[PDB]
């Protein structure tokens, strides 16, 4: 549905003929993000699905083609949807922290073969936003330091 969303939106925006005819319907992206704002309060059962979802988005539509319209925009926006989600949640749902964090790191460390640019970008945003929330989840960092020896160079500095 989310891919379809973005295909639709790309086709619309490139094209005024469709913009004249179709009334601007909200896109699924937007709906999900709005879910997340309403999510804030008391919605543990939705958020725990959210996280899984977003990581499915990232896993699936992280880049591969360097190791165009069609492969970039509804993939780039998929991945960065993932990211937007998980950041927005990480602002407000303070109990699914260390599981974003640990899942990020889980995709950081080992792969180094699939391009992983997006994950560190995510991680940067995550951390910058509140690092004080990682002195509550600190151990999860120090065990990736034990793998810092084994990592390609661009990965480590960044």
């Amino acid at each position: 549905s989310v891919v379809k969303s973005f295909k639709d939106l790309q086709l619309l925006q490139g094209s005024k003929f469709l913009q004249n005819l179709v009334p601007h319907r909200s896109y699924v992206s937007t709906m999900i993000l709005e879910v997340v704002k309403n999510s804030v309060h008391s919605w543990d059962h939705v958020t725990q699905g959210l996280v899984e979802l977003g990581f499915i988005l990232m896993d699936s539509y992280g880049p591969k083609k360097v190791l165009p319209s069609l492969s970039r925009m509804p993939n780039q926006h998929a991945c960065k949807l993932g990211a937007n989600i998980l950041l927005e949640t990480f602002k407000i749902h303070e109990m699914i922290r260390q599981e974003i964090l640990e899942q990020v790191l889980n995709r950081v460390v080992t792969r180094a073969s699939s391009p992983i640019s997006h994950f560190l970008d995510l991680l940067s945003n995550i951390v910058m936003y509140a690092p004080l929330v990682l002195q509550s989840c600190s151990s999860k960092v120090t065990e990736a330091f034990d793998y810092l020896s084994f990592l390609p160079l661009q990965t480590v500095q960044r």
Binding site: H41, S42, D44, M95, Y129, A130, P131, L132
Partner: protein, 126 residues
């Protein structure tokens, strides 16, 4: 000591949020040459009260269930997220209360329920 201590905030979730946000965004401005207070003041960008009146300011500071202070070391700390109630409680009293009621549902370490006094959504994390 001058280094940042582990710190966090009790009270109203709607009141606590701008403190955590402001801390998080400005925490890089923390500086370990000053004092803890002199750092905290420009980091959290607020002042403290110096003995407003610390024995009785103007609040029945008791639990409002057990109507005591000092139940077994514990302090009134868990409060309502409401301007009109703001009623403190104890962890123990409010836990036993919410665990009874039919409305309450338990996630992993959290229980959501209704404040005894005002019947507004109140959270307890064990």
């Amino acid at each position: 000591p001058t280094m940042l201590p582990e710190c966090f905030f009790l009270g109203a979730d709607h009141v606590v949020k701008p403190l955590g946000i402001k801390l998080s965004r400005n925490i890089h401005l923390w500086d370990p040459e000053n004092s803890v207070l002199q750092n905290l003041k420009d980091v959290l960008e607020i002042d403290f009260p110096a003995r407003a009146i610390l024995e009785k300011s103007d609040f029945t500071m008791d639990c409002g269930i057990c109507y005591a202070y000092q139940l077994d070391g514990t302090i009134p700390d868990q409060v309502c997220d409401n301007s009109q109630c703001g009623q403190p409680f104890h962890q123990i009293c409010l836990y036993e209360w919410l665990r009874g009621l039919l409305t309450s549902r338990q996630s992993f370490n959290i229980i959501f329920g209704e404040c005894p006094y005002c019947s507004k959504p109140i959270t307890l994390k064990m």
